[PDB]
Scaffold this active site. Structure first.
Site, PDB file in Angstrom:
ATOM      1  N   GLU A 130      10.563   1.794  10.491  1.00 28.74           N
ATOM      2  CA  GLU A 130      11.539   2.841  10.204  1.00 28.74           C
ATOM      3  C   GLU A 130      10.787   4.159  10.348  1.00 28.74           C
ATOM      4  OE1 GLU A 130      12.695   1.571   6.286  1.00 28.74           O
ATOM      5  OE2 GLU A 130      14.037   0.001   7.092  1.00 28.74           O
ATOM      6  N   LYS A 135       0.871  -1.174   0.000  1.00 27.71           N
ATOM      7  CA  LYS A 135       0.000   0.000   0.000  1.00 27.71           C
ATOM      8  C   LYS A 135       0.914   1.231   0.000  1.00 27.71           C
ATOM      9  CE  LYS A 135      -1.702   3.012   2.135  1.00 27.71           C
ATOM     10  NZ  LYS A 135      -1.430   4.457   1.757  1.00 27.71           N
ATOM     11  N   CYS A 172      13.900  11.555   5.723  1.00 28.13           N
ATOM     12  CA  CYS A 172      14.062  11.233   7.132  1.00 28.13           C
ATOM     13  C   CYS A 172      15.500  11.398   7.579  1.00 28.13           C
ATOM     14  CB  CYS A 172      13.668   9.786   7.365  1.00 28.13           C
ATOM     15  SG  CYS A 172      14.608   8.672   6.280  1.00 28.13           S
ATOM     16  N   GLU A 196       9.943  16.970  14.798  1.00 31.89           N
ATOM     17  CA  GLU A 196      10.279  16.803  13.381  1.00 31.89           C
ATOM     18  C   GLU A 196       9.401  17.718  12.534  1.00 31.89           C
ATOM     19  OE1 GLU A 196       9.077  13.215  10.916  1.00 31.89           O
ATOM     20  OE2 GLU A 196      11.246  13.062  10.580  1.00 31.89           O
TER      21      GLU A 196
END
Ligand SMILES: NC(=O)c1ccc[n+]([C@@H]2O[C@H](COP(=O)([O-])OP(=O)(O)OC[C@H]3O[C@@H](n4cnc5c(N)ncnc54)[C@H](O)[C@@H]3O)[C@@H](O)[C@H]2O)c1
Ligand SMILES: NC(=O)c1ccc[n+]([C@@H]2O[C@H](COP(=O)([O-])OP(=O)(O)OC[C@H]3O[C@@H](n4cnc5c(N)ncnc54)[C@H](O)[C@@H]3O)[C@@H](O)[C@H]2O)c1
Ligand code: NA
Ligand code: NA
Ligand code: NA
Ligand code: NA
Lengths: 484, 483, 483, 483
Positions: free
Chosen positions: C251, C175, C285, C387
């Site tokens: 992750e 997905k 990231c 973040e």
């Protein structure tokens, strides 16, 4: 009409002397082969040494591997020419060259190229008195110039078995194939050239052993290693020759391999298995079985079944319909094998089948054929049961006891391979482990996985190649220790 | 003191004995029984047979436990081992006590532990019939291991071979250097009292040529010959075992360089080169006998080293403050002096040392020489190219990185190299281009038993350490099961 | 243009659809069909069945060959894949061409090759009866792997999971992010044309909660869920699969620091931090959003970075010299600008940027922001801790090595760090002390597919890469045979 | 007798205590102090701080020597540990003495040795600039490890987690089963007396939900939670640590099968299934509760097993020739007996057992049940599908190899399986098709600490043992140096 040139520093070159390449099927001339002198060998080694400092040496492992896959592609593109070359030089049945030898040779290059891409080394952390520590890491570097000397048995296969990992590890190569089978190696040089392999990376030198290209290669101080496949005595000679230079060595030598058939074997499967292990390539593979031990309870049925099957083998032309066996490699080798055939009778053997040469009544009578042969009746001390014959022959002896047969298998100055036949789980694992050889098969013969270590014990060799053992042998293993 | 052979579980004398001499004062320490061909054969046969006895039926766990008992036996007689190494060699007591003996104990415990934790591989493969096959590898004992060792750090180098041989389940016939037979004899006792089965560990004393060493190498009953010594000896042995196609491992000579870049910690590098040049009185294969220093710091480097060299205390192994003991022997002393002379005749400038000290006691009967430093020789000089194996180094300026790499590599030897720099890229970039088995950066003589160790070119062939020992001292076999 | 699901070898539509919008100019690229729960069930069932089909019967060599064919198929349609990534994301064409598409290809080829070269283990053990036992390990397919991926570097991160999953013989329901569905749909076409058996690879489009993503994680037929995305999403998925005790790999997010020591090559570090802060418009990231610079070089660093940042070309993906495309979406831009405001309210000095560029063309309807630099904030500021995932970094001075190590580690994230220093000891000493999964020294973004990759703390759990992928995507089974 | 918590170097009581009862006779053994959330915090904080203490500064060699000291300390109090396990669990003395305590010792020694011998990886890479880069991996302590363990083989399964946790340099907060607190408390004393620094090992007693167990899982200060217990408990814990994204290792329930083919050694298979069904009175996760026997030998197998089962001595842990002690608790017995009745209601034939023995002494106050054998149930019976964790097996015939493999795999569990056959091909071919973490052929319960261990499906997630432990209990970090 075929001419096989040396390939030195990106150029095909002739030599002062040439020698005959003869089809063992009919005794006819196939090619003239230019024999490299000591000066050309020096040219090859010097070119190899310089090539390490050229583009080859600057290639990333990834680009180097891609180039090696290009070599494999080139063999693939000229597949049937390589098939014709092996068959012409050796009399090998076409079906076997086409289905085994050429695909395995291709597989040699692809596999070691892939191993080179995926391999890594080690990191070791250590504490020190001052308590800030140190790192030790290992690296693989090219060893340098690899001298390769190979035999006439399965020539393209055994040749590329050494040349592939050598090149995959970033080395440069000077290679000397058997005088009896120089064609496919010459074709390989063409593929190298066409694939764009830099001059001096791969060098091909033709010739013999003593007082020829082989010996000159071994005595050359510019090489870093000598990898060799051939006779035990040749091995010893080469080991002495490189000794003053303390060169890295790898030896794959002779054998006198046993097959053992236990009472609980699948008998039809073992008969088929021993038939193949005794007579494939007309008995001319270092992995063949020349000693066979069969449990007393099934001995007579086994021997009778193998006789029937052996007498159904078709000995004939390499592309003859249904052919199973071609000729031996040479008249010289045939004379040696027949000399053993006589010796067997003289030693008291019963000749179950064969023992002679076939009669063709055509050009093949000028070739080098012998009959597949089975003996019984000899004691374990007979020369014919102890010395490697390298022909299509096996002696079969009964046994009663598991420890007994293991001891008789191990009672030999050779220790290359053994095949064991049994349906019992514990027996397979217990017995295999006690055989003093580098390779045991259970319920099959001649399965080779390139990832596995391969080699022999005692006179059958020293060291191992295959998988990480090739990656380590064809590399300089260096330790860099950094104080923090 | 009498040093007997140890054969099939028995301490035995021989027809001839030779003298073990204390190199500090030239006195007799012991007489040593020289094994003859008959005795070597007895040892090899006992080893072969031992493989079929209780030793060969021990689990890896029990075998390792027994090896830990050997180490325990050394720990319990620690000072006796210290005394033995010191007496044989003249090695400073503090060094034997803090480095050598503990390292020897470490060898046994580390390889026992490696054996316990090691494993092998499984490869699955597909076949035509579509039922597949399994290939697995096993490590088995190789058989009888012949061990021949030198006089430099004798117990350490001896057990470096003996420990992994035993850890892999082999039996051993071991021939220590004629110059240093005591600690190896003590080890035999330890093995005997630890209850190691007869024939597992066999000790034979003697020389090389026409003596026990040669007899061992010629014996068809061994499976491998592992060796540490001179390169010419290595070549000789390689020829001797060639007909039997015996497995071999050669750790040979060297002419190691130290390189000091302009961006080095100069005081750290001076100390580093001092130790690497003069430790064990320059009698270690890892010593630096060639030093390359960047031109911009050359004079200061040589000055500081001279000062530190001259602060070195040369005396009794138990003397307070001692840094350097004697050379191993008068013969070796003669050789080294012969080089001291050759250097001068070659045009060398003697920055310090260049002769022997004077003690006016028993030590004048010993075999001492002075820590020595040369400058001004060509790269092509004999003293810069040939291994001397004394407390000496030649120092030469250099200018460029690629230059000094080439000069370091311009050698038929390639054992070790030490590099001094504080720059991150330079450290890794340069180290990787040195043609040797071992590079240290900013230190000297760190050794980890897990790492591969060996040399290139004339400095040897093969590697030992960690898995390389576990693989060298084992038969690696491949078992392929069709399913 | 319409993007369909790919289920059991067929491209299929759905009852509901959503827009794929070009972030460069807000224009419609495609309609995307959202898989419902029934279609996700079909996909998982098909994947379970394919494990029993021809896929499950391939030898490893033939499976790896098929994977190389997939790779060949991408290579053959290279520019279409480039166009798809660029269209969906605004990614500069130069980067998609030189990094993303080649890396995606390399993902398949590397893991296929790892599969062919991989092996397992053999352990021998002793037993009481003294006959012994063999233990061998095998890798078998884990089963159906559910893959859920993000919009940052979409084909790269998608194939980073799909490739080792297929290499290990699993079947896949995948997905991709609703923001970047094109290249995955192209991949489905490549699989189809390559002749990959029906059900081996299934593509389902949609969102997370109450959509395809959630439906996948809740399905009892999968064997593992591997995930790359926000930390809060990871936690949510970890709960969702908990009743099934499904294997997991996460992750997650980060707040990575770059550290520039006084001995750094200053120009290199400015260039390095420029790239680590603003590449992909700050939307990787692995980007640095916190920068620590030694006080001695702080002002010069910040001035140099300001100048280089102001030379960045923000614009069209195929504009000459373009460095930055837009953010992924207007929604993301709204969040990022909200952080731009927050920074000022928290007391930041805006060194450069802090708003949106003015193009006076269709890009004004896109989702662009300016590369932005802050100073003057405390380590506790929200803008320094949370973040942001935009092209921004805060820069702060430090004085001491242990200090900066502690400040870097003082975070609930621990993904990556970059360190700039020319000193050998420092690089190794400091890197080892940073609490993250990945440290670079004197570079940024080098990834080798053989190495373990992953984060600590909120940045993830587990590792993938090389053997870690080969082991995560496989059942590791132990077969122990008594002999 | 009182069992205290051990926190930051001190044994401490708590506000409330709970009863430790001997399952042999229902009598009180100890009062156990239940840690509250406040004390759990104290433990985690102490473990966090000890990371920065002396423990954090030990070399790996020193850490390992200290762990060996712990093992030595257990060895020195050997019979005290035997007594503790026996008292808590009713375990036969002979078994605790020959298996349990020596295994617990071996857990510490083996992982200490793995620590010393372990290493990591080096990957070289090329770069566009052509100067290249080094990538190396390091293992570092993960942080604070939370350990939660069950009552089945208490000390064995407890040390199975604590040993590697400590060997990798972590600090530990460990919560043993409320049913078996004694040996773990004794272990705390050993650590204290061995001089393990305060905070490194912390012991907290209590229950799960609303007690020490839950509080530990919910503490954000831990880095991982490793767990052995019921599958539902596993799922609960996986949810609990999800917001923190804590590393997890789950060893959960099973419903293991034994398969006896017609070519098995029948007497060996009977003895093997007898042991796998009834060892520890059926209270090991590796026990067989489903047995499939080829129809040709079904009746003979069942008759032979009945006879051996009726020879088992159920009684006092030090009773002569005792084979089986009691179940762990009255609550567990009530559950097992409910299954015994359920089996009858489900239509089972009771071949032997099916109730509790009558002792006519204090053991009637204990928690004993009979070893029990059922036949006649369908594969869909609850008693053939749900884990009972008692001394019981159902035995069913089978006809075909593919049939029995399918019936073995038809389970939401997948921990272990034992197969009995003398045929080489069958052993390897059948074993690889069983969907579990561990298959034994021709034996039961052989465990080698180097091998990966774990289950699939509801039986767990992840693997421990050998390198899997060294990697799970470590941070795996990648350091990448541009040259
Ligand atoms: N590569 C290394 O790791 C390493 C370590 C220490 C020393 N060394 C080298 O060793 C040398 C010094 O030691 P050495 O003087 O004792 O070396 P050596 O070669 O003279 O003697 C070594 C051993 O071999 C024996 N030997 C001699 N001739 C023999 C023969 N023909 N057959 C069989 N055995 C024979 C000796 O008795 C002795 O036991 C130096 O060159 C030094 O560099 C190398
Ligand atoms: N897979 C394996 O290797 C293995 C080994 C042994 C036992 N087991 C399984 O263990 C089970 C039996 O042991 P058990 O009855 O002690 O298991 P359990 O799940 O009931 O309890 C185990 C531990 O978890 C604790 N706990 C319970 N609820 C908790 C919660 N909500 N939060 C935190 N901790 C909680 C308990 O206090 C105890 O310490 C069996 O299913 C058996 O199969 C598995
Ligand atoms: Na020929
Ligand atoms: Na001496
Ligand atoms: Na989009
Ligand atoms: Na209890």
């Amino acid at each position: 009409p075929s001419q096989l040139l040396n390939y030195i520093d990106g150029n095909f070159v002739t030599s002062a002397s040439s020698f005959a390449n003869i089809n063992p099927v009919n005794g006819k001339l196939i090619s003239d082969v230019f024999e490299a002198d000591a000066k050309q060998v020096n040219e090859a080694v010097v070119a190899a040494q310089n090539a390490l400092k050229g583009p080859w040496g600057k290639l990333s492992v990834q680009d180097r591997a891609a180039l090696i896959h290009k070599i494999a592609d080139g063999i693939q593109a000229r597949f049937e020419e390589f098939v014709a070359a092996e068959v012409a030089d050796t009399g090998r049945p076409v079906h076997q060259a086409r289905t085994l030898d050429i695909p395995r040779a291709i597989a040699n290059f692809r596999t070691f190229a892939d191993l080179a891409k995926t391999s890594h080394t080690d990191l070791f952390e250590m504490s020190t008195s001052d308590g800030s520590g140190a790192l030790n890491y290992t690296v693989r570097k090219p060893l340098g110039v690899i001298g390769v000397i190979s035999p006439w048995a399965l020539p393209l296969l055994l040749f590329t078995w050494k040349v592939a990992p050598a090149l995959a590890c970033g080395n440069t190569v000077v290679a000397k194939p058997s005088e009896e089978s120089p064609s496919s190696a010459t074709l390989l040089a063409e593929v190298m050239h066409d694939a764009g392999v830099p001059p001096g990376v791969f060098n091909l030198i033709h010739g013999f052993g003593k007082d020829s290209a082989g010996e000159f290669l071994t005595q050359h101080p510019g090489i870093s290693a000598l990898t060799f496949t051939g006779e035990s005595k040749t091995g010893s000679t080469i080991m002495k020759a490189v000794a003053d230079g303390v060169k890295e060595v790898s030896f794959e030598l002779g054998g006198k391999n046993a097959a053992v058939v236990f009472a609980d074997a699948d008998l039809d499967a073992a008969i088929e298995g021993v038939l193949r292990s005794s007579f494939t390539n007309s008995g001319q593979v270092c992995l063949c079985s020349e000693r066979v031990y069969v449990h007393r309870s099934i001995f007579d049925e086994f021997v009778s079944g193998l006789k029937v099957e052996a007498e159904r083998l078709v000995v004939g032309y390499p592309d003859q319909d249904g052919v199973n066996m071609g000729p031996l490699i040479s008249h010289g080798h045939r004379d040696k094998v027949l000399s053993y055939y006589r010796l067997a009778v003289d030693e008291g053997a019963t000749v179950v089948t064969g023992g002679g040469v076939p009669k063709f009544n055509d050009e093949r009578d000028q070739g080098a054929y012998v009959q597949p042969t089975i003996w019984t009746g000899l004691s374990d001390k007979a020369r014919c049961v102890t010395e490697e014959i390298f022909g299509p022959v096996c002696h079969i002896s009964p046994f009663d006891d598991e420890d007994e047969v293991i001891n008789r298998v191990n009672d030999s100055n050779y220790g290359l391979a053994c095949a064991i036949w049994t349906t019992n789980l514990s027996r397979a694992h217990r017995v295999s482990r006690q055989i003093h050889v580098g390779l045991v098969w259970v319920n099959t013969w001649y399965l080779r996985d390139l990832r596995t270590p391969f080699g022999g014990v005692k006179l059958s060799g020293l060291g191992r190649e295959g998988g990480r053992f090739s990656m380590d042998f064809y590399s300089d293993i260096a330790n860099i220790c950094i104080k923090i």
